[PDB]
Amino acid sequence: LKVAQTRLDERTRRPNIELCRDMAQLRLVNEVYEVDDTIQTLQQRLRDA
Amino acid sequence: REMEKLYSELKWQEKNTLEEIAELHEDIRHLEEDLRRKLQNLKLCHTRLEARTY
Amino acid sequence: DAYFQEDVPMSIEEHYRIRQVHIYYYLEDDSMSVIEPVVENSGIPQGKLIKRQRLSKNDRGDHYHWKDLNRGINITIYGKTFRIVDCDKFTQVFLESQGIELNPPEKMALDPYTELRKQPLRKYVTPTDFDQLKQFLTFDKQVLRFYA
Amino acid sequence: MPKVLVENAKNFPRCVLEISDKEVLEWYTAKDFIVGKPLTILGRTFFIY
Amino acid sequence: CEQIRLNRSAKYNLEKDLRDKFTAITIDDICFSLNNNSPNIKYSENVVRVEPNSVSLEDWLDFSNTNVEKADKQRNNSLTLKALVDRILFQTASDLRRQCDVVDT
Amino acid sequence: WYRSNLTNFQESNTSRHNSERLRVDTSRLIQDKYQQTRKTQADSTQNLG
Amino acid sequence: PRFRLPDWQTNSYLLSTNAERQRDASHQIRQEARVLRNETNNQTI
Amino acid sequence: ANRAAQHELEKDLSDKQSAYRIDDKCHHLRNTSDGVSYFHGVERVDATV
Amino acid sequence: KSQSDVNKKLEQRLEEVRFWKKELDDKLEQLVYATEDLLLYQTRLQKALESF
């Protein structure tokens, strides 16, 4: 999660034009959410156990 | 560049697919031997019944 | 930065008091000292609580070394339990440079007596300017029709 | 005009004193006279169009 | 718990360098990427003529090789601990077990 | 007596089935979340790359 | 023939987006497999 | 004329360069790599241009 | 040719400083992984103190 969060944290400082919205911008946005999902998931199975 | 963009992506989806294929050869084998060993348990619960009707 | 709740059940002002302190650790000879800052209007004899000495940790003779000192910790010294709440940006730097993970902060707690002696804050917000006169001047000679 | 009275009208000498500045929670303004929607003056429902 | 302290301290120092190295890598990237027709190419005073806080190549290599060794040293002092607690656990268990089977008899 | 014993023995057998469930299924979830996050991250790399 | 460049671009997109759902379709069967196989084997023992 | 080129052309090389700088590092932002920190909000920021 | 040399020399310094950023990160990895085991083995030990 933090690897992804940071990977993006810096890409949000690219100068003028650079700051874009390419494939990377998404796969990373999707990944962060996906990872957040896995964490919430295991949390339930922990409560279940 | 545009084709090297597409080719490098196209090669990368191959190795991602080939990894996805590789662990599908072993899964269906594990499904098959699961199916086949569970035949042996239907074999068992039969054999108890009629030695009992005896 | 630390604090400790002792008791005060014989008073009319509250049932529990908070005594603000700063606890110092010395790297010269692994020593500690506890200093109580002077509160302006408190009746307690403020001052120095514990001098510079190697304060004992347990009964076997061990003393407090800096390995087990964090931002949030409840070390007890001579019957008094101190809840440290925060460090300064030099103590943090030293502790993280040795491997020690700094705990999350806590606020300070507050003594009910001294905060109930906070004299009133003499102020009034200014009244508005949209009185009868300005509402008469900026909205004169204009009325709305409504057909109903 | 008063629209909603403040919450002490049950102990208010409204037989011998009038409804002054402090008794009104909100007065009628230009927002209340919506052109198109029904409006309720005292006793009467209007249809400002 | 104390080996953890040493290992975590080791990192703090290892990180300190990892960070500084980056800054230097970036600096040399902008130093390399500089032609006579580049945008902001201005003059200066005393530039780096003298430096009262620098270091030599011999030294830069010491700092690195030293910091590296310290980390390998702690790692090798960690695999030891990890393999002295494995028995300590196997031991503790088997011991209490032996006595429990005894008390039974 | 025969009833009580069963009511008990059965309830015991039961809570040892609802526990075994979580256990073997946790293996699935854990060996999934991990391998998922792994290849999902590698995606970010290839893309960023 | 002489298929034009924009319909050539969607050829790569179609093959690429085929890979994502198809690997995920295969991946979906997996988790459905192990959830079955485990409770299949455990139930009958 | 051929100067108006440089201006933009070179105003591009800079952004093009800062890109590689704030993009190559991300290509190798490994897990547990000096830096990987925590940021809450880098999954809802997209000031893309 | 003068500039060519200072460029080649700056280029070489990069190769070196980068090799050292690597042998200092691959080491971070080893030591972080070492600590991960010790912290998990710590849990296993803590549980035992109560397990008995």
Side-chain angles (χ1 to χ4, degrees), chain A, chain B, chain C, chain D, chain E, chain F, chain G residues 1 3-45, chain H, chain I:
Chain A
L1 176 114
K2 46 194 4 209
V3 156
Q5 306 250 72
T6 301
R7 222 173 247 219
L8 278 174
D9 122 275
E10 221 13 81
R11 254 181 133 246
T12 68
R13 231 64 47 70
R14 293 172 309 208
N16 341 98
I17 167 77
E18 260 19 85
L19 231 221
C20 202
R21 235 237 34 103
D22 71 308
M23 157 123 306
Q25 217 92 216
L26 244 245
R27 323 298 252 82
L28 259 309
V29 149
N30 322 330
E31 236 239 329
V32 165
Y33 265 127
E34 166 259 334
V35 180
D36 130 78
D37 133 81
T38 83
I39 285 144
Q40 233 318 287
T41 304
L42 299 163
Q43 290 253 114
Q44 196 40 66
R45 201 66 96 72
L46 185 58
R47 306 164 69 252
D48 300 340
Chain B
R1 178 66 216 141
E2 181 65 26
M3 161 294 298
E4 277 154 345
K5 182 63 66 68
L6 282 193
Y7 173 98
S8 296
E9 211 76 29
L10 184 63
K11 298 298 293 295
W12 187 69
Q13 305 263 20
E14 205 272 345
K15 294 186 290 294
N16 278 14
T17 295
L18 183 63
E19 174 265 351
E20 196 87 15
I21 296 169
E23 61 88 20
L24 183 62
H25 186 74
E26 62 96 24
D27 191 0
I28 286 165
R29 154 71 60 61
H30 293 344
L31 275 296
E32 173 172 350
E33 64 94 18
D34 196 0
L35 195 151
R36 189 172 61 248
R37 73 170 68 184
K38 286 297 294 294
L39 184 60
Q40 294 297 109
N41 178 317
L42 177 68
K43 299 293 183 182
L44 162 54
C45 65
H46 276 219
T47 315
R48 306 187 143 188
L49 266 177
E50 53 265 10
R52 192 178 183 185
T53 62
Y54 289 166
Chain C
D1 213 348
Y3 85 98
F4 60 103
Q5 193 194 160
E6 316 171 301
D7 209 0
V8 60
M10 283 73 74
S11 81
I12 70 170
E13 59 192 6
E14 67 271 13
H15 298 282
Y16 81 110
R17 65 151 65 96
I18 301 297
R19 205 155 163 182
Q20 273 94 340
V21 290
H22 309 280
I23 298 171
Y24 304 84
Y25 197 94
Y26 302 91
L27 275 298
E28 317 276 347
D29 59 310
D30 291 331
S31 185
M32 321 206 278
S33 186
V34 180
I35 290 280
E36 200 206 318
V38 175
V39 189
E40 174 59 46
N41 216 334
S42 195
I44 297 169
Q46 314 280 127
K48 182 174 72 68
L49 295 176
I50 288 158
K51 44 162 61 73
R52 284 201 60 201
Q53 65 183 357
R54 315 180 42 83
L55 280 165
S56 66
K57 164 152 71 203
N58 60 6
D59 62 358
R60 80 179 77 252
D62 291 331
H63 315 131
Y64 289 96
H65 183 75
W66 49 252
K67 294 153 191 333
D68 72 26
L69 259 59
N70 290 318
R71 183 178 292 171
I73 193 66
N74 219 320
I75 62 170
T76 182
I77 296 160
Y78 283 170
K80 325 202 191 52
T81 65
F82 298 85
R83 176 62 158 261
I84 297 89
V85 288
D86 198 61
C87 300
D88 62 358
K89 68 174 74 67
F90 158 75
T91 304
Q92 294 179 357
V93 162
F94 176 79
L95 285 185
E96 66 183 1
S97 81
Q98 313 299 310
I100 300 166
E101 190 276 331
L102 277 296
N103 275 337
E106 282 156 290
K107 64 91 175 179
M108 152 56 88
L110 287 172
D111 199 328
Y113 157 80
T114 181
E115 85 188 331
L116 260 58
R117 298 187 73 92
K118 186 180 289 293
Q119 71 276 63
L121 274 299
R122 285 139 162 170
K123 62 167 63 67
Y124 64 98
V125 290
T126 45
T128 183
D129 49 293
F130 305 143
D131 63 357
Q132 173 164 250
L133 189 39
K134 299 289 94 176
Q135 180 93 320
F136 169 70
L137 285 163
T138 198
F139 275 121
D140 200 56
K141 312 301 264 181
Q142 293 179 356
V143 193
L144 295 174
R145 287 183 180 177
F146 290 124
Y147 294 152
Chain D
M1 296 297 171
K3 184 178 184 293
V4 177
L5 270 77
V6 65
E7 47 266 16
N8 56 6
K10 268 80 65 180
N11 298 114
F12 166 56
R14 64 187 185 274
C15 82
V16 77
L17 261 56
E18 272 87 355
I19 171 168
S20 54
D21 178 38
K22 183 264 289 181
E23 311 325 309
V24 185
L25 184 58
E26 60 181 0
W27 288 284
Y28 279 86
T29 44
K31 182 67 173 66
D32 291 331
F33 298 155
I34 297 170
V35 177
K37 299 291 180 68
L39 172 86
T40 306
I41 302 299
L42 56 86
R44 308 169 190 83
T45 68
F46 286 158
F47 204 110
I48 298 176
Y49 53 90
Chain E
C1 300
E2 187 66 36
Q3 177 88 212
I4 269 134
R5 221 208 26 103
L6 325 154
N7 286 31
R8 296 235 213 92
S9 177
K11 259 157 294 150
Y12 177 87
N13 327 332
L14 265 239
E15 281 132 18
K16 284 244 124 7
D17 343 308
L18 241 20
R19 195 170 327 252
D20 302 344
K21 213 88 36 169
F22 176 69
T23 339
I25 294 183
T26 315
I27 285 295
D28 284 353
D29 296 342
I30 322 148
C31 300
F32 204 49
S33 330
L34 236 162
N35 41 312
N36 330 271
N37 356 103
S38 252
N40 246 158
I41 337 185
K42 60 223 82 43
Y43 277 68
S44 176
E45 284 82 31
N46 317 307
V47 265
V48 86
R49 281 323 147 90
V50 86
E51 231 334 290
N53 240 210
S54 77
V55 100
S56 84
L57 219 3
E58 151 258 338
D59 288 295
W60 182 75
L61 236 283
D62 140 75
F63 190 50
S64 65
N65 218 312
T66 302
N67 263 43
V68 171
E69 288 338 274
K70 307 160 24 248
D72 344 316
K73 263 15 110 244
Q74 282 311 316
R75 240 244 331 182
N76 297 325
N77 290 8
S78 97
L79 313 152
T80 312
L81 202 36
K82 259 120 43 78
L84 256 69
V85 286
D86 268 329
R87 339 259 15 103
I88 241 353
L89 254 316
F90 165 82
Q91 292 306 117
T92 281
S94 329
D95 308 343
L96 239 190
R97 290 174 34 250
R98 246 40 76 96
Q99 204 56 37
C100 247
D101 125 79
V102 168
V103 157
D104 149 73
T105 63
Chain F
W1 194 42
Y2 227 77
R3 280 349 105 213
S4 72
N5 310 326
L6 263 0
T7 331
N8 292 290
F9 292 178
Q10 277 21 75
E11 197 36 68
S12 89
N13 233 26
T14 303
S15 157
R16 293 196 257 95
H17 199 161
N18 332 320
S19 68
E20 248 252 297
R21 215 152 339 238
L22 218 135
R23 292 220 292 95
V24 81
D25 194 60
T26 292
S27 95
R28 191 208 31 77
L29 194 60
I30 292 205
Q31 230 341 94
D32 148 78
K33 278 336 175 239
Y34 166 58
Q35 230 188 285
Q36 221 247 287
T37 43
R38 278 265 133 118
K39 305 133 48 83
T40 328
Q41 155 120 5
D43 216 319
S44 138
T45 316
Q46 190 260 357
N47 295 304
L48 218 355
Chain G
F3 292 165
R4 155 191 31 71
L5 194 78
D7 61 73
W8 178 79
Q9 290 180 354
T10 194
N11 165 28
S12 177
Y13 161 74
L14 278 160
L15 264 183
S16 68
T17 188
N18 199 359
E20 187 70 29
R21 84 200 170 260
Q22 188 176 4
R23 285 212 317 281
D24 286 332
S26 65
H27 165 81
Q28 183 66 41
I29 304 183
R30 305 242 161 212
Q31 319 324 128
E32 296 173 81
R34 267 85 177 187
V35 66
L36 190 64
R37 297 159 26 89
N38 282 319
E39 78 207 7
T40 290
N41 280 113
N42 287 33
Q43 185 97 48
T44 304
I45 62 170
Chain H
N2 40 239
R3 194 31 194 225
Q6 301 248 324
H7 204 209
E8 222 325 291
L9 233 286
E10 93 224 341
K11 264 157 19 215
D12 209 329
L13 216 19
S14 60
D15 312 348
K16 241 350 126 317
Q17 249 88 79
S18 215
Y20 213 112
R21 252 150 291 295
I22 330 158
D23 270 301
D24 202 55
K25 146 246 351 262
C26 287
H27 185 30
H28 321 97
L29 211 128
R30 305 132 20 227
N31 293 244
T32 79
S33 70
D34 165 79
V36 43
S37 122
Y38 250 157
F39 307 96
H40 309 108
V42 287
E43 45 143 23
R44 35 248 16 241
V45 49
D46 211 353
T48 283
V49 294
Chain I
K1 299 172 335 260
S2 82
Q3 196 135 333
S4 92
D5 296 306
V6 326
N7 284 40
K8 182 67 207 325
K9 290 177 131 31
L10 254 142
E11 156 188 351
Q12 284 158 296
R13 188 74 169 95
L14 257 345
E15 321 304 297
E16 243 284 83
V17 309
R18 264 103 158 267
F19 156 87
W20 273 111
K21 178 129 141 303
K22 184 201 49 149
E23 310 268 83
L24 264 175
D25 68 49
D26 298 331
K27 232 329 116 22
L28 208 81
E29 290 136 41
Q30 257 112 112
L31 189 77
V32 191
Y33 300 154
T35 327
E36 250 115 36
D37 197 350
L38 252 222
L39 281 159
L40 140 111
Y41 265 19
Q42 164 159 130
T43 316
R44 157 191 53 93
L45 227 151
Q46 304 239 168
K47 120 205 356 165
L49 266 324
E50 270 38 68
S51 101
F52 31 81

